[PDB]
Symmetry: D2
Subunit: 419 residues, 4 copies
């Protein structure tokens, strides 16, 4: 089934075919003059996939308010339908990231709906940062690192339940992000809290399938405003190293202190084999969770530069999980996810254009200016023609958002869904 009529996609592609051909051939010639085969780039671009968050499909909110749009998805099933649109048009988001209990539903049915829509499932995400009605023990003061044994046990059990749901739908990993920390100095004993967390995570690791990975996600602050147990990549490394080979670190771009060189963290984790994956988004102040690349596109390019370099250096067994973790508070969630996915492919595409041989020589000779200009020659390249062509060739739209709007999908779901 196709959420967006195929005739609309065809019509909107034909409407832009002429211009695209000119832009693509123009870029192809320019790249050839630079010794790059544009076909080789497009080929890799159409293979780059990033998972879409179920929680990004509906309108998000802040601690102050939530302003829903029309046709808000009623549950995980409506969310999957909307995710299908993103994948149909960008062809870059074949897998969906689920969050439990937000997306709790019959696993078998989730699998059926996913298969019918042509969608897969990425890492599962546990939730012990909020209480569910009728919950025996509250996570107000923590979960996996809570002082109360029963509360930790409950948190662990919930994570095991997430694993069970994931196994039913085809997921192969569990991402653990908790709000555990303190809001006041002295409230928590930093070391003891971390010891409890490590002990609890060891129990989850014990119940982790051998064809699964366990991802721990660090965050400097929020919901905890004084200290957070898994506060940065340093603590995260200690966790992954301590737990085992199947445990790795997940880097969410917006979870770092102001001015942090995030691309270096990525490099460090790769070198020591603990870079499990990414949670893509952009920010300017805190964990803003804005559309990827909308604030600092160069930074996004530099992160991918490290990923591509890893391959170039011959790093092996390197297959980071890529996921978008965003909240869309003032835009059509589907549109933002579409352009965010496009932006991630944009950064990846530019990273592929870096002349590694040239860069290597400038680094060795300490020619900083030419080294940075070598990175810029790649970043400054407008790879949109490649992104559009990759989409067109794989059943997607030349201009996803334009086709999305031309289809009238939002008004359609608005009529189908309550207000």
């Amino acid at each position: 089934e196709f959420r967006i009529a195929q005739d609309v996609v065809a019509r909107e592609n034909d409407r832009r075919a002429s211009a695209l051909k000119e832009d693509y051939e123009a870029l192809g010639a320019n790249l050839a003059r630079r010794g790059v085969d544009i076909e080789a780039v497009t080929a890799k671009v159409e293979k780059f996939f990033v998972a879409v968050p179920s929680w990004g499909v509906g309108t998000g909110g802040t601690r102050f308010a939530r302003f829903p749009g029309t046709g808000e998805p009623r549950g995980i099933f409506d969310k999957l339908d909307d995710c299908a649109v993103i994948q149909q048009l960008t062809r870059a988001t074949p897998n969906v990231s689920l969050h439990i209990p937000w997306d709790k539903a019959d696993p078998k049915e989730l699998k059926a709906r996913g298969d019918a829509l042509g969608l897969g499932f990425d890492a599962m995400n546990s939730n012990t940062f909020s209480d569910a009605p009728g919950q025996a023990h509250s996570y107000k003061y923590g979960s996996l690192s809570h002082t109360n044994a029963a509360t930790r046990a409950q948190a662990v059990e919930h994570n095991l339940e997430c694993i069970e749901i994931g196994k039913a739908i085809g997921s192969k990993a569990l991402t653990v992000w908790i709000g555990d920390g303190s809001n006041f100095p002295g409230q928590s004993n930093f070391t003891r809290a971390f010891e409890r967390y490590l002990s609890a995570m060891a129990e989850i690791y014990k119940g982790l399938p051998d064809d699964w990975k366990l991802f721990s996600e660090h965050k400097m602050y929020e919901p905890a405003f004084y200290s957070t147990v898994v506060q940065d990549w340093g603590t995260n490394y200690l966790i992954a190293q301590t737990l085992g080979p199947k445990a790795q670190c997940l880097v969410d771009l917006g979870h770092h202190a102001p001015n942090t060189n995030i691309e270096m963290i990525v490099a460090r984790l790769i070198q020591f084999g603990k870079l499990g994956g990414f949670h893509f988004n952009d920010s300017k102040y805190g964990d803003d969770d804005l559309d990827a690349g909308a604030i600092e596109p160069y930074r996004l390019f530099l992160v991918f530069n490290e990923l591509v370099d890893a391959e170039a250096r011959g790093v092996k067994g390197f297959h980071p999980a890529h996921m978008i973790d965003q909240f869309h508070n003032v835009t059509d969630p589907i549109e933002s996810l579409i352009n965010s996915a496009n932006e991630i492919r944009r950064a990846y595409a530019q990273a592929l254009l870096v002349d590694r041989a040239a860069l290597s020589g400038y680094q060795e000779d300490n020619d900083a200016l030419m080294a940075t200009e070598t990175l810029k020659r790649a970043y400054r390249t407008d790879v949109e023609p490649i992104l559009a062509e990759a989409r067109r060739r794989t059943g997607g739209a030349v201009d996803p958002v334009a086709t999305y709007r031309a289809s009238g999908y939002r008004a359609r779901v608005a009529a189908e869904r309550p207000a």
Copy 2:
């Protein structure tokens, strides 16, 4: 009416009177050696008041979750009852700051309850950063600076109603904080958006009584994550200067960029007569809204040092409004507000101890070390005996939190009020 039994307050004071006497006399002796009359300090401390937020007595939350405790207040009347407890035990929070429409209710009943509890009302707070039921225009894309004329008018009308409610209950000011801003470059035109805001505020200004003040509150970010119309004190000054004499700037401690020298902003606003008031709280990362002084007590003291210095050299009827703006997500709201009000008086008391004459000399001599040590000599002084004696002398408790727990108030209201349920904040 006494929310907390007088016998309990008396009992809990007698239990600690002996130790207090010793500490107070020791401190009095130390201050005397320093040429300071402990009695003069206590006399001023007894008269220092800071407004408590009504939204502060209820458990707060984050965008990820809210964990309500037992006996959560149902509405403004329950909240007023709880604020009465903070005032009775600390004697430092006689006025409550209301937020509309969270606390909307009959002005006669509000004023009636306040009077019976011995509570007054500080500045009113308007809410155009959220949508209420039946609202004709959404504030999703802004309010006073929204591109839609009808929306701006609706926001203006709401503020005018806030002034109306405040006039009926004895309030003398309106504080305006909005989330207006953008999450993406290009979404808003910085200039046009600010021009729209100024024009809307002008209409609100026209509705201000002659003895009222309009406080605009800046904030770097949240809920807007790319730009905010009233992002800092610079824009805030432009606003106040543009609107008029009754318009001044409100400084919320946790609303500044990382590493900002906040005490300097206070000085600058005072110098140009635009320091409307304060929103006290503490933080480490963003607008954490934590208990005042719990993270950086020295910074709080330094802010009060600017306030006391201005006071010491008599300036333009200088009387900024002091208010606490905090959310308590992991403690008993009443206890945190009690100790936060205490910390504010603590910083004030310490600022009073600064030898202004000596500091002035060291500043003119460019003796940086002695100048900073002059400040530290005051700050390092443990003024707790003063704070406790000030409380004891005015009908308060020597140890407020201790007295609060001994009274069993929380267990009491928990039994009278419906049980609560945890859930999310507005993440989805």
Copy 3:
């Protein structure tokens, strides 16, 4: 000609074919977007940014300085090097001088400038360091120093900068001082600012009718607790207090972490106090790195505000543009060349924004299409436009490549002795 014309010719010819292909390709793409590439190029070749005299020599940190070969011996050598930057980029016809660093006979300075085809931008005073034979030290401040005689000495220095500037063609004085404190209590915030205001008022009195006085704010460094002119708020208060000739200068790296700098620019323009810019890039503090090397989009967003001002028809809006950078690990001339290029790049992209469409998306609160309208311009590779603008005006298609081909650095290295103490 600092750089041989035959070299510039040879290097341009070697790249003419590729430029033609890229420019014409870009031209067609722009035409399809309703934009005339010729109109963009015509404006780009006229965008100028002043080159800092202090940026031509290698810079350093409080830890060390690593000079390269052929470091300029004085201001005259610096002007010679600035001539290279202008000849190759054609985007830096004016130089910004710093007194006393560049103190010399005004007549000679002017003669060298005219000979090289260079002009002079705003003068820069220096009361953040002590010069020989000074009666009072600026250790504890200058224009805001508690000692009246020290403030007077600083005022006199600024007036002298104005006299030098008048003689050489300058029409503005930029004032940046380190005045502030490293400890709470060391300074009375208000009295220190009042002293500063009194001093600046005197300097203002020495301003010719057609001159401007620019005060430059900075959050910290050299002062590490408080700085008198710490941010744009205090800066606005200064400009408004002083008068019509007093305006604010914004140095990109002088703001608190995460500050929305483009908004400050918009605010100052709205109230007519945006005197000019000090361009550079940074990641941590006032790093003074090559413009656009760290955050190119932010640079573009700043220019988006500058172009919007013209779009909105702001009157008498002629901000001064100056590069304020230090080059610690690269050939200063090469960094200044590419930095000037980056600035023209951000400017050109700002010119490509479809303001009509943008205006529509803003009014309809279509945040996604509004930001995409900005991105469509920013994502455009305008390098061909920059290169064509240079070709037409006597510059180099690839400035740094041409600079390296000329062997200029090696030449001046043999002419200039390295300082030994």
Copy 4:
């Protein structure tokens, strides 16, 4: 004795009465709190922090240096000044040397220290600046430089620092380098780190059995885009990779804005890699200001983690403590005196925390009482304890007051030639 004993005695007697009153009052308050003031004073008397040789001279920024009078020139003058701090505070018996700044015949250094009653803490290498005659420049790095010969030169310099240290009684080498990049792409993060690790392994081999090697992380400066040893995470990787003798040194002002530093301290202690501390305070960057002059509570919280660690009896816990500050606008000796004082103040308050009560409130999630339990200790004015500790150990009740009364600064000013006067 640098300071006349009669002056110390006279200034102590002058303030003995008030001290007795305050100490006794504090003793009674603590008594009521179940604490023996005598036990606290006894521990404070034994808390020592290394004074940096580079701390007694006036510091500066990249913009300027404003030397005071009697500036110490060379290590011998510096040791004489350091002796004044130790004599008056009795809290800084050991000095931290920096090579080559303090290079001199080891025998003479040892002799001079013994004569002044001063020992030597960790040695400090310097490959972040170039020395005269140096074969290879550290402009683009040192231990992680791409040029093999440059790395070898840096390794040898470090080995030389160990040799000097062994001769004077030092038992550790602290390695802080500016290695990094100012531009994206300039360095390959991983390869640069691999080169550093290989270089440090060589240095590690020259370590005696009883020596420690400390690596000090820093977010930025002098490198403004990336730094090889940028944070504690990379620092942990280094220490763990090198071996048991390698540990991490934490300099308070070397972290990103808002970083929870006390947590990093706890984490390093838990994994046995907390080598030591570099004390100072800051507000913006690596300001290197007097310890506790900006954020005294943060300093207390760091000591809370240290005192707790001992309370828990953690293994591998025995951190070195050193002051690493620069004094740009004060008498360096007075600042080091009051900084050492602040450090003992924070230590003393940490000793007052009721660990049993705290533990209870932590287990019961009573956040308010847990934090108040810390505040009850922090709010306590321990100055009487600090003053008494000094008085009882040969120091001054009021160090700075005694220092000024002695007229020391004027004395050395008359013995040492200033650049101009």
